[PDB]
């Protein structure tokens, strides 16, 4: 009972820490990259800017 529960919770939570962080960071850089170098055409939050 305790062994099967610990496997499913680790599977649900830990899976998004690796690829989803890098994929969203790349899409954040890509919108800024498509925005050019000296003109923020992508409307990003102040912290990410």
């Amino acid at each position: 009972e305790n062994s099967q529960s610990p496997n499913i919770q680790p599977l649900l939570h830990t899976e998004n820490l690796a690829p989803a962080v890098v994929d969203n960071v790349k899409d954040d850089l890509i919108v800024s990259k498509g925005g050019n170098s000296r003109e923020l055409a992508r409307n990003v939050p102040v912290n990410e800017m």
């Binding site: 923020l40 055409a41 409307n43 990003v44 939050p45 102040v46 800017m49």
Partner: protein, 293 residues
């Protein structure tokens, strides 16, 4: 996109959408209100006549009649379908600074440098009421109910007046200096306010204390009246500043979007009624439509 449309000759002040979300109107020192489309972003009528510079537009809630607040006492009225004059609401003995409208498009409130608030009917051509304070007034807002009218002056004291009583019911406190724009939510439950202390404070309508003091949007020597708005949800707050930046807040007390783009001081920021767009105007003669995907 963003869309930075050019058109005006001189400092533009006010730019607003219809209640529907299908047009802009804009007009400042030009003495020319210039109507626009939203979705092929082209001009329409050159509403010509105002012999003072414009300080405030507001669409009638029919999306047809437009109202101005010139620097020569007039408050004009325009048929946005045809583009003809209707009236010249002649009253004040000085420069008007703000306007506000109701649900019922019939009643209007204006604010002079005579220290006089005045409520207008769109049928009489004269004043219904005349509330004389003392120091020249600047910003006004009327509630959705058609009951409470908020006045903003030079004392930093946003006074509240009803249409039945006409008594100094309540006075907002803790604002050290100058008010440039009031703004009631789409609930009728809270104001926004730009002071010259750069504290873009929110207030309550009913107990009547503060909510959240926002801080980070400077006014300086220019002495333009800067604006604030409530977003269609009432999640976001959009305050412009003389730092060329549109400081959008999170309404939880967090700066999210701070987008530059203008080369001069910003005036009246707005929001579209449904889709997330931001009208931002500035002495510069330019205007943006900042979006969120």
């Amino acid at each position: 996109p963003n869309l930075q449309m050019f058109g005006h000759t001189a400092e533009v002040l006010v730019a607003r959408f219809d209640p529907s979300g299908s047009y802009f109107a804009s007009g400042g020192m030009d003495r020319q209100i210039l109507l626009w489309n939203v979705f092929d972003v082209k001009n329409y009528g050159v509403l010509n006549g105002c012999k003072g510079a414009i300080t405030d537009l507001q669409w009638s809630r029919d999306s047809r009649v437009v109202y101005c607040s010139s620097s020569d006492t007039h408050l004009m009225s325009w048929d946005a379908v045809s583009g003809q004059k209707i009236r010249k609401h002649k009253g004040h003995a000085g420069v008007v600074n703000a306007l506000d409208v109701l649900k019922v498009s019939e009643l209007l409130t204006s604010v002079s440098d005579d220290c006089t608030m005045k409520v207008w009917d769109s049928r009489s051509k004269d004043c219904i009421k005349t509330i004389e304070e003392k120091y020249p007034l600047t910003a006004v807002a009327i509630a959705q109910q058609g009951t409470q009218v908020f006045i903003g002056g030079i004392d930093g004291a946003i006074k509240i007046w009803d249409l039945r009583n006409n008594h100094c019911s309540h006075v907002l406190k803790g604002h050290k200096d100058i008010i440039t724009s009031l703004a009631i939510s789409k609930d009728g439950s809270s104001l926004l306010s730009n002071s010259m202390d750069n504290t873009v404070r929110i207030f309550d309508v009913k107990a009547q204390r503060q909510l959240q003091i926002f801080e980070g949007a400077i006014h300086g020597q220019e002495h333009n009246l800067l604006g604030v708005a409530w977003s269609r949800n009432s999640r976001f707050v959009g305050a412009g500043s003389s730092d060329k930046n549109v400081y959008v807040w999170s309404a939880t007390g967090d700066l999210r979007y701070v987008l530059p783009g203008h080369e001069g001081s910003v005036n009246h920021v707005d929001f579209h009624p449904h889709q997330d767009i931001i009208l931002s105007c500035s002495s510069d003669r330019t205007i943006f439509l900042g979006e969120l995907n």
